[PDB]
Enzyme design. Structure first.
Site, short mmCIF file in Angstrom:
data_model
loop_
_atom_site.label_atom_id
_atom_site.label_comp_id
_atom_site.label_asym_id
_atom_site.label_seq_id
_atom_site.Cartn_x
_atom_site.Cartn_y
_atom_site.Cartn_z
N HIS B 41 15.04 -37.47 44.06
CA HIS B 41 15.11 -38.91 43.78
C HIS B 41 14.11 -39.36 42.69
CE1 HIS B 41 11.60 -40.25 46.12
NE2 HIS B 41 12.04 -39.60 47.19
N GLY B 143 4.30 -43.64 46.51
CA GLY B 143 3.71 -42.63 45.63
C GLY B 143 3.43 -41.31 46.34
N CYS B 145 5.68 -39.48 47.89
CA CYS B 145 6.83 -38.56 47.86
C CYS B 145 6.49 -37.27 47.14
CB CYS B 145 8.07 -39.23 47.27
SG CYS B 145 8.59 -40.72 48.16
C1 LIG Z 1 12.87 -43.70 42.53
N1 LIG Z 1 11.65 -44.18 43.18
C2 LIG Z 1 10.81 -45.19 42.77
C3 LIG Z 1 9.88 -45.34 43.75
C4 LIG Z 1 10.21 -44.37 44.74
C5 LIG Z 1 9.58 -44.13 46.07
N2 LIG Z 1 10.31 -44.89 47.08
C6 LIG Z 1 11.39 -44.13 47.70
C7 LIG Z 1 11.86 -44.72 49.06
C8 LIG Z 1 10.82 -44.48 50.18
O1 LIG Z 1 11.17 -44.34 51.34
N3 LIG Z 1 9.52 -44.46 49.80
C9 LIG Z 1 8.37 -44.32 50.61
C10 LIG Z 1 8.00 -43.14 51.25
N4 LIG Z 1 6.94 -43.00 52.06
C11 LIG Z 1 6.18 -44.07 52.27
C12 LIG Z 1 6.43 -45.34 51.68
C13 LIG Z 1 5.61 -46.47 51.92
C14 LIG Z 1 5.88 -47.67 51.32
C15 LIG Z 1 6.97 -47.80 50.47
C16 LIG Z 1 7.79 -46.73 50.22
C17 LIG Z 1 7.55 -45.47 50.82
C18 LIG Z 1 11.97 -46.26 48.93
C19 LIG Z 1 12.86 -46.86 49.99
O2 LIG Z 1 14.20 -46.35 49.89
C20 LIG Z 1 14.30 -44.98 49.84
C21 LIG Z 1 15.53 -44.46 50.19
C22 LIG Z 1 15.74 -43.10 50.14
C23 LIG Z 1 14.70 -42.27 49.76
CL1 LIG Z 1 14.95 -40.55 49.77
C24 LIG Z 1 13.46 -42.77 49.40
C25 LIG Z 1 13.24 -44.15 49.44
N5 LIG Z 1 11.29 -43.65 44.37
#
Ligand SMILES: Cn1ccc(CNC[C@@]2(C(=O)Nc3cncc4ccccc34)CCOc3ccc(Cl)cc32)n1
Ligand SMILES: Cn1ccc(CNC[C@@]2(C(=O)Nc3cncc4ccccc34)CCOc3ccc(Cl)cc32)n1
Lengths: 306, 305
Positions: B41, B143, B145
């Site tokens: 992603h 951040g 991930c």
């Molecule tokens: C492309 N990008 C920009 C920023 C990001 C990073 N966000 C990816 C995201 C996710 O879950 N991120 C996070 C992971 N762990 C803690 C977090 C604490 C606060 C905010 C976000 C968090 C956003 C939500 O929706 C999804 C759907 C599916 C997937 Cl696989 C990933 C996500 N990715």
């Protein structure tokens, strides 16, 4: 989101762990630059442990009596001196893995990571706090002496603890990296006991703010309290007095959540009176006191989950 | 003495953490040999995350679009491929700090250490367990991930988890290092929920043996139970079934403490029906389930790495 007991990454400290053997005694040493630091009781012969005269025992030692092992390489000891309860072995090689570091002495309530070692080899890392009675509730077996406590704030390692002994209650006592013990303890096998321990109040409050930032508000109440009324209640549950310093330290978390310190203090008083009633706060049925206000800010977001 | 939630030393993994930036997205990558592994992603944007065709998004990318940073040194990406939900960026330089490693997929109940990273820089290490609902109760901010889960066996790092997302309940979801998610999750902005979780029974029993080894015996009783009778009780309290393999795994701890596994099971059954009654076990008012039998033996014997 989520709140875990989190230790600092231990890599910078692992590259400093060495094994120190003196006669039949083997323990851990901290190799920084061309010096290996370790508990001075490595020169003791078990019999000596009751009333050792460390100056007398050290004067009888020569550099070649101390065997220092860094991985599968034996370091050459070229000097030895004692500073309080720490032995400093000058070696002929500067540790190439020496990180940026400082020696800091911490106060009760402060937290740090411990890299538990046996025979100069790291086996685990955990987060711990200096209890108000100056002991730490660690996880240490025989051979763990010389294992260190540290904090890693912004690439620099602040070494704050070196393990020396286990008290009869299973709690641990040690020194800062200058050899000064935390607490009224001595490196002798004479009868020693940890004083009655108390809960670190400022840390519990910091953890209640972490719970609020993580979306848990069930324990909050419409009450406030005076600092003195709170302390009169706190002392009855063996909680450390909360000082104006602690109230000030909690200011940023109070500003971020919109809950005044004395409001959170009233919620804590109510928790102490009622218990949790089958509920949990951040996955815990007890009030956690091993997260400082600084740990909560470090781990938690800058946006509260309203 | 003492029993702590203990993670493996993270040094071997810290020397592998890199920052991966693709467009506006920055996250962590795992640099092993000449390959950087990261969540696929990283190629997504705001609209792309809603309904992503990762093959379509990846085909439009070139090697120079991926900025990989190892410390203050920028690595040059010379190839890119996708394996399930992980992106593999071939780099020109083999990581000189690459430890002996394996990619292992773990089962629910198994524990591992997580090295939480932000911008390719390790900031914390904690111990966690793969819940029976395939989520982990982690501590991750935006951040994080690409942060990884691992175990150490001898001198070999077994990478078992890579962080991908946070579910609405605050729990976390991710994949093994081959990109296969743990659980019924997908890497897309869509409605996803963690299933009802259950307690890891074999782990609670292992933690009760750790409490006995540490001098906490108040919960022990004279009783024993059948595996069938215990499983009936366990199912009632949302506890995972205890199998004969779990009983066998607990054998060494049973031998060391003199408490047979079904003897400790009667003690767990009483704790479930009657509670702790204001008492604690290893400083906890709840039954801890994030220590496997192997973790208990490791910590109550001093295995080093
Ligand atoms: C492309 N990008 C920009 C920023 C990001 C990073 N966000 C990816 C995201 C996710 O879950 N991120 C996070 C992971 N762990 C803690 C977090 C604490 C606060 C905010 C976000 C968090 C956003 C939500 O929706 C999804 C759907 C599916 C997937 Cl696989 C990933 C996500 N990715
Ligand atoms: C001869 N010798 C040199 C080093 C050692 C190593 N033992 C030193 C000792 C000590 O407390 N060791 C331990 C430290 N941490 C965890 C432990 C878990 C189980 C058993 C022992 C442990 C035991 C004797 O009582 C004292 C008095 C004072 C001091 Cl400072 C040190 C000790 N023995």
């Amino acid at each position: 989101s989520g709140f875990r007991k989190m230790a600092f990454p231990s890599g910078k400290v692992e590259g400093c762990m060495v094994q120190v053997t003196c006669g039949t005694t083997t323990l851990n040493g901290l190799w920084l630059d061309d010096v290996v630091y370790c508990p001075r009781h490595v020169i003791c012969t078990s019999e000596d442990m009751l009333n050792p005269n460390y100056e007398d025992l050290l004067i009888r030692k020569s550099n070649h009596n101390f065997l220092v092992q860094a991985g599968n390489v034996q370091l050459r000891v070229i000097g030895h001196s004692m500073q309080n309860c720490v032995l400093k072995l000058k070696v002929d090689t500067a540790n190439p893995k020496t990180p940026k570091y400082k020696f800091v002495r911490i106060q009760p309530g402060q937290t740090f990571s411990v890299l538990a070692c046996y025979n100069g080899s790291p086996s685990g890392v955990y987060q711990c706090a200096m209890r108000p009675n100056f002991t730490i509730k660690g996880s240490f077996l025989n051979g763990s002496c010389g294992s260190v406590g540290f904090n890693i704030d912004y690439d620099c390692v602040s070494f704050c603890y070196m393990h020396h002994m286990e008290l009869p209650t299973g709690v641990h006592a040690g020194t800062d990296l200058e050899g000064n013990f935390y607490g009224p303890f001595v490196d002798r096998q004479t009868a020693q006991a940890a004083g009655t321990d108390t809960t670190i109040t400022v840390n519990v409050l910091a953890w209640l703010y972490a719970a609020v930032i993580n979306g848990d508000r069930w324990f909050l109440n419409r009450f406030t309290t005076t600092l003195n009324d709170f302390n009169l209640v706190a002392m009855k549950y063996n909680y450390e007095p909360l000082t104006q310093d602690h109230v000030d330290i909690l200011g940023p978390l109070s500003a971020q959540t919109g809950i005044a310190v004395l409001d959170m203090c009233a919620s804590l008083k109510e928790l102490l009176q009622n218990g949790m009633n089958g509920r949990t706060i951040l996955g815990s049925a007890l009030l956690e006191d091993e997260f400082t206000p600084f740990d909560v800010v470090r781990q938690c977001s800058g946006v509260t989950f309203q």
